[PDB]
Structure 1
Amino acid sequence: LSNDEVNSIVKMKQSLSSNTGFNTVLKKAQLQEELEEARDAHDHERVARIEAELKSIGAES
């Protein structure tokens, strides 16, 4: 397989990916980074949506 084919297969399985702890942690980190970017831009509307999404994704055990 080529590198591009590997990336395509990984994206396909990510679309198929229901949940994975490593991927959930990565998604939460990316969401936190996006939230701080929105905070620095004084966007009070996006930050509410990002906070709601973070609350929904979180609550681990």
Structure 2
Amino acid sequence: LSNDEVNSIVKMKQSLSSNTGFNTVLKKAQLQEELEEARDAHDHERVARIEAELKSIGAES
């Protein structure tokens, strides 16, 4: 397989990916980074949506 084919297969399985702890942690980190970016831009509307999404994704055990 080529590198591009590997990336395509990984994206396909990510679309198929229901949940994975490593991927959930990565998604939460990316969401936190996006939230701080929105905070620095004084966007009070996006930050509410990002906070709601973070609350929904979180609550681990």
TM-score, normalization by structure 1: 1.00
1:60 & 1:17 partners in 2: Cα distance?
Answer: 19
Q: Which runs of 5+ in 2 are unaligned?
A: none
Q: Which runs of 5+ in 1 are unaligned?
A: none
CA distances 1:6-48 after superposition (whole Å, capped 9, x unpaired): 0000000000000000000000000000000000000000000
Identity of aligned residues (%): 100
Give the number of equivalent residue pairs.
61
TM-score, normalization by structure 2: 1.00
**RMSD of aligned residue pairs (Cα, Å):** 0.0
